[PDB]
Amino acid sequence: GAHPGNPRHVGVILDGNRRWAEGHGTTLEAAYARGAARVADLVSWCETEGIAVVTVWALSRDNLRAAAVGRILDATAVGLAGIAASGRWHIRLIGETDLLPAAPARRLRSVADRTATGSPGTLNVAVAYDGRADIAGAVRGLLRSGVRESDVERYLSTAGLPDVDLVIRTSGERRLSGFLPWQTAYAELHFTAALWPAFSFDDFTVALRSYRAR
């Protein structure tokens, strides 16, 4: 069950992998493999707190500017294996996965699809996601259906995602960069200085305490 005072839906922008790799002399894929381990840490800490909906923004559409993107997607899918094997999180993909290389995209899809019975948590993994594209998808979805604010929300590409209560962005960047513009409208915004591959339990506790203290 949920604890009152805790956020029902936490969204995390997994920022800082590129900077972390350059500072440590590693590849980008090694940073995303470590970033995937931090996602596993995150959902474990959320579980202990009874937080059942978690959305992580792993890859933006603008940052798709081929070979590295495939390695990134594969390192993420492998790093999510422990979450999948836990059976305690239903992993879903959001974003325009059709813009990703087909073979690594399929392997990421195959990891998520094996968690259809995961419960009670929901982990939404955003790849090739763009907030303005999310909103634009609502206007095309309405067109195909042949107008209230609830009607726009119903046809977002992320219509399956509810309101976000707490947004965490790492790497010290004080921006949302279009992360779920509809669902984060009234979200508490917390900015962590640490780069995502170094996201710690202290960072998590500080973020949650900032939410409860609002």
Q: Is 15 annotated as a binding residue?
A: yes
Identified catalytic residue from 6, 63, 130, 134: 63
Q: Is 165 annotated as a binding residue?
A: no
Q: Is 20 annotated as a binding residue?
A: yes
Cα gap 29→167, rounded to integer Å: 25
Q: Is 151 annotated as a binding residue?
A: no
Q: Is 41 annotated as a binding residue?
A: no
Cα gap 69→46, rounded to integer Å: 28
Cα gap 127→100, rounded to integer Å: 9
For the beta sheet containing 89-94, the strands, ordered from the edge strand earlier in sequence to the opposite edge, are 89-94, 121-126, 53-57, 9-13, 166-169, 188-191
Q: Is 107 annotated as a binding residue?
A: no
Contacts of 146 (CB under 8 A, 6+ apart): none
Q: Is 132 annotated as a binding residue?
A: no
Q: Is 177 annotated as a binding residue?
A: yes
The helix or strand, by DSSP H or E, that contains position 125, with its residue range, turns out to be strand 121-126
Q: Is 148 annotated as a binding residue?
A: no
Identified catalytic residue from 6, 15, 41, 98: 15
Cα gap 89→123, rounded to integer Å: 6
Direct distance between the N- and C-terminal alpha carbons of the chain, in angstroms, rounded to an integer: 22
Residue 63: active-site member: yes
Q: Is 176 annotated as a binding residue?
A: yes
Structure tokens at 5: 């005072």
The catalytic residues are 15, 63
Residues that constitute the known binding site: 15-20, 60-62, 169, 175-177, 188
Residues that constitute the known binding site for substrate: 16-20, 60-62, 169, 175-177
Residues that constitute the known binding site for Mg(2+): 15, 188
